[PDB]
């Protein structure tokens, strides 16, 4: 009776959680490509030659004098380094923006499925 529900109520929580965490993590990495498109905007905007504090190590930033605001990375392959134009980044970002977009969306149905299902397991337990 409820012993089935009590195991069924507890289980269906975590897959909400497991999926709640996933898609929540699929926005950020999706958003950095937006921001990597954005970081490139102020880049071109100031000029070549500016001092750029750029991540150095734990607790440090290294300042450096900018050159070629048209220089951008695109990491594709596994880790492979593809340096690209200021234009090529934005679309490659937008691909991986759109690439995680669906990857975000695949989670929500399976995210929400285990709640209203769990929610049905709460009632007959108490009721």
């Amino acid at each position: 009776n409820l012993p089935q529900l009590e195991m069924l109520k507890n289980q269906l929580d975590q897959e909400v959680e497991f999926l709640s965490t996933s898609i929540a993590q699929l926005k950020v990495v999706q958003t950095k490509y937006v921001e990597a498109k954005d970081c490139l905007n102020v880049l071109n905007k100031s000029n070549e030659g500016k001092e750029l504090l750029v991540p150095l190590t734990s607790s440090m930033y290294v300042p450096g004098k900018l050159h070629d605001v048209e220089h951008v990375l695109i990491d594709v392959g596994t880790g492979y380094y593809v340096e690209k134009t200021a234009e090529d980044a934005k679309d490659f970002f937008k691909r991986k923006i759109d690439f995680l977009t669906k990857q975000m969306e695949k989670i929500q149905p399976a995210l929400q499925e285990k709640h209203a299902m769990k929610q049905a397991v709460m009632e007959m337990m108490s009721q």
Binding site: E70, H71, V72, I74, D75, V76, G77, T78, G79, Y80, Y81, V82, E83, K84, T85, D88, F92, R95, F99
Partner: peptide
Amino acid sequence: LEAQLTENNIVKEELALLDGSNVVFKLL
């Protein structure tokens, strides 16, 4: 890798459209 697979086909697209404009390092 399957994500990177598309990328590994796209990196064949990206670098082949790089003639040496942007400095190409391997990240290996």
